[PDB]
Every structure is written in structure tokens, then in C-alpha cells.
């Protein structure tokens, strides 16, 4: 394998380099949203982000060393967690709002337009607020997102995945030491970052149950890819 021989700085560069782009929503600002129209925009946006995420994953060191079946498993498990952490990352500099796209920045009141969505909105905002208070850095963010991809579904092949995971941990510590943090501060910060992943799992599970709900309600037809990634959680 090749991810295992990278330096910490090389890991960071590889991840930074692999970052997907920020996508624009459709959306016309001259009209408040209905439940149906908001879901439409969000669904169309999520679907397109998904395509980019899949290609990002191939650029994550170690990931392509995995069998196709395992790549599929990890992505089916982590896809929503990954979309979510990306969303809160780009929302960091917009307290109180979620930046779904440069032309689609929403507050929790607008999240009310969709039944059951405001709860998840609140959690996403709380996550954004937490990242903001920790002053999460871009280099730390990309490490976390990769950890999610490899960790969430990690149920030999597993040993390799854990090695890669260990490498990213090394990378995170490397970064913190560079920032001048003491040994104690490094462990503490590492812990704080990794514990937020639990909340992100939680948001994903709650969000998932819900996407299933709206599907059922058939307010808006979900994309073929979303439905596939969704059914995988069943």
C-alpha cells in the first residue's frame, strides 16, 4: 500500500487536494419555499454532491487499495455523515445559518418549511457552532472526513483500514503539535474532535430515518442514487 508511507504533511496535501468543489443550488430567491420546493432543491443538490463525494473517496489514500465490495460498503454506510460534515464545515463562518450552497444559505426558521427537518437543522447548527468554538482548521476537517469514510462501516482488509486510520490519527497529532499545542492539549483536542463524530453519526441516523419518511410520503421523488444509498440502510 501507499497511504501508509506518506508523511503527515503529505497526507494533509493529498486530502486537501482531493477536496470536492462547492456546488451551487438551482433556486430563485424571489419566492419563499414550500415544503415541496425546498425538498426539491435540497434533493437535487444532495444528489450532485453525492457524485462528487464518490470521486473524492477514490482520492482518499488507502481507499482505492480496498476491494470494490468494501468501497461500496463504506460509502453506503458513511455517505450522509460525509455530506453532513461537509455542510457544517462550509457553514462555520455563517453562525445561525446552514450554507447548503453559496446561493442557498438557510436559517432554522426556513428548516421549518419541511416537516421534521428543523430538528436535524438544529443539530447541524450545533455542530457548526462547536467547530467554530474549537476553531477547527481545514487540515483537521479533511482528516475527520476521511476518518468517517473509513471508520463508520469498518464492519485483514479491516487491518489495513485500521492502519490507514492510525495514519490519519498520526496526521492529526502532527498538525496539533505544529500549532504549538502541548502534549496534553494534543490528546485533549484529538479526543474532542473524535467525539463529535459520534454526534455526526447520530445526525446521520436521524436524517436517514427521515429521508425514508419523505420518500414514503412521496412529497418529492428522490433521485435514483439517493434511493440506492438510502435502501442500503435497510
Amino acid at each position: 500500500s501507499l497511504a501508509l508511507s506518506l508523511t503527515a504533511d503529505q497526507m494533509v496535501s493529498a486530502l486537501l487536494d482531493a477536496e470536492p468543489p462547492i456546488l451551487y443550488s438551482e433556486y430563485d430567491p424571489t419566492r419563499p419555499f414550500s415544503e415541496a420546493s425546498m425538498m426539491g432543491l435540497l434533493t437535487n443538490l444532495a444528489d450532485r454532491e453525492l457524485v462528487h463525494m464518490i470521486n473524492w473517496a477514490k482520492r482518499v489514500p488507502g481507499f482505492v487499495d480496498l476491494t470494490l465490495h468494501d468501497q461500496v460498503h463504506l460509502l453506503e454506510c458513511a455517505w450522509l455523515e460525509i455530506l453532513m460534515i461537509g455542510l457544517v464545515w462550509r457553514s462555520m463562518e455563517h453562525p445561525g445559518k446552514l450554507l447548503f450552497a453559496p446561493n442557498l444559505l438557510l436559517d432554522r426558521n426556513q428548516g421549518k418549511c419541511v416537516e421534521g427537518m428543523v430538528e436535524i437543522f438544529d443539530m447541524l447548527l450545533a455542530t457548526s457552532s462547536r467547530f467554530r468554538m474549537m476553531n477547527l482548521q481545514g487540515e483537521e476537517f479533511v482528516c475527520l472526513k476521511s476518518i468517517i469514510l473509513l471508520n463508520s462501516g469498518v464492519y485483514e482488509e479491516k487491518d489495513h483500514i485500521h492502519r490507514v486510520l492510525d495514519k490519519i490519527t498520526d496526521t492529526l497529532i502532527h498538525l496539533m503539535a505544529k500549532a504549538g499545542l502541548t502534549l496534553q492539549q494534543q490528546h485533549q483536542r484529538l479526543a474532542q474532535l473524535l467525539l463529535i463524530l459520534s454526534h455526526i453519526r447520530h445526525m446521520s441516523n436521524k436524517g436517514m430515518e427521515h429521508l425514508y419518511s419523505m420518500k414514503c410520503k412521496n412529497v418529492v421523488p428522490l433521485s435514483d442514487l439517493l434511493l440506492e444509498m438510502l435502501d442500503a440502510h435497510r
Binding site: 464518490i54 477514490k58 470494490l68 461500496v72 460509502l75 453506503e76 435514483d224 442514487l225 440506492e228 444509498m229
Partner: peptide, 9 residues
């Protein structure tokens, strides 16, 4: 699986 195809390239 669409995910399958997109992965394979």
C-alpha cells in the same frame, strides 16, 4: 448499483 458503476469509473 449506480454506486457500483460510478466507483468502477
Amino acid at each position: 448499483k449506480i454506486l457500483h458503476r460510478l466507483l468502477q469509473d
